[PDB]
Write an enzyme that holds these catalytic residues in place. Sequence first.
Site, PDB file in Angstrom:
ATOM      1  CG  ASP A 122      -4.692 -32.607  26.267  1.00  0.00           C
ATOM      2  OD1 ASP A 122      -4.756 -31.370  26.238  1.00  0.00           O
ATOM      3  OD2 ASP A 122      -4.497 -33.265  27.304  1.00  0.00           O
ATOM      4  CB  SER A 143      -2.988 -12.965  25.823  1.00  0.00           C
ATOM      5  OG  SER A 143      -3.949 -12.035  25.452  1.00  0.00           O
TER       6      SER A 143
END
EC number: 3.4.23.22
Length: 330
Positions: free
Chosen positions: A35, A199
């Site tokens: 994770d 992004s």
Amino acid sequence: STGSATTTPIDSLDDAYITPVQIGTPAQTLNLDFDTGSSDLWVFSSETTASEVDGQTIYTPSKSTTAKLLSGATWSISYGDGSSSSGDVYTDTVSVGGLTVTGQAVESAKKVSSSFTEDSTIDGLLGLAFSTLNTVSPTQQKTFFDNAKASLDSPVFTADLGYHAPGTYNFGFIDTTAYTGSITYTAVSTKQGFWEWTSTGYAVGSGTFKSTSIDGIADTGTTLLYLPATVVSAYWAQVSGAKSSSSVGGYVFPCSATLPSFTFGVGSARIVIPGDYIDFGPISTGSSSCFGGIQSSAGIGINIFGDVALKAAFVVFNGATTPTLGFASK
Ligand code: NA
């Protein structure tokens, strides 16, 4: 040193991926959920409340000649999905894919929430976010990556998750055979303890690319892609009959649909998520309503590039002094 381990989807939807991990001496192999959005290595154990164990493999520290109680240390964690676990702490030898760390904090669960009990395939989590998020008190502990780092050939690990197929976690090296083209690197903020990046934009299907900054985290422990409601609406507007269902808890779409791809920007590069990756199947067995793999992040307080996005790429988690993320097509 390096390590290389295969990671395997737990089910036909790629809800999560499990990676075998050797703990203790002699080795006890547990299947952990790696994770990158948390920083605790915790396991089902011989200490776990018996009624909260249902088919998991447990770590028994009393059977390990290298286990030592970390006296006084406790831990307690709550995840974004509302799940939780807590317990005490041992140090032990932990190996992943041939890479060994001695003295790793192994957080032994005394209690787990129902979603962990009900998932017989996940024996615990191995956190790969920054050690500033580790929950051990009163002495915070390091992640497996942070403890391995100085021994690694390169201070990196890579996630290469499969679509309906096994993939690989590598530590300490880039496998230049595992991706196509070049790797595009992008800046990371560690301010919230996550692999947080920005992004450069998105496109829906064959649509024009929209240049827009989307701050989010690279989180291998999250199944879906959670993005701002504007972006998610734009995507699902291209699917006839798709709608956001308050009763189901997100966007659903007719199971008869063919989904468009979704593209995200990494600097001037583009990662394309095929439409098929966004189908999470019937909302209940036999339903003709299917659950979407792109969902709104509104109310979660952060955008999450979870497995739906990450499995479309070869992802480099660069833990050099100035961390960075890398993305390649594959
Ligand atoms: Na679900």
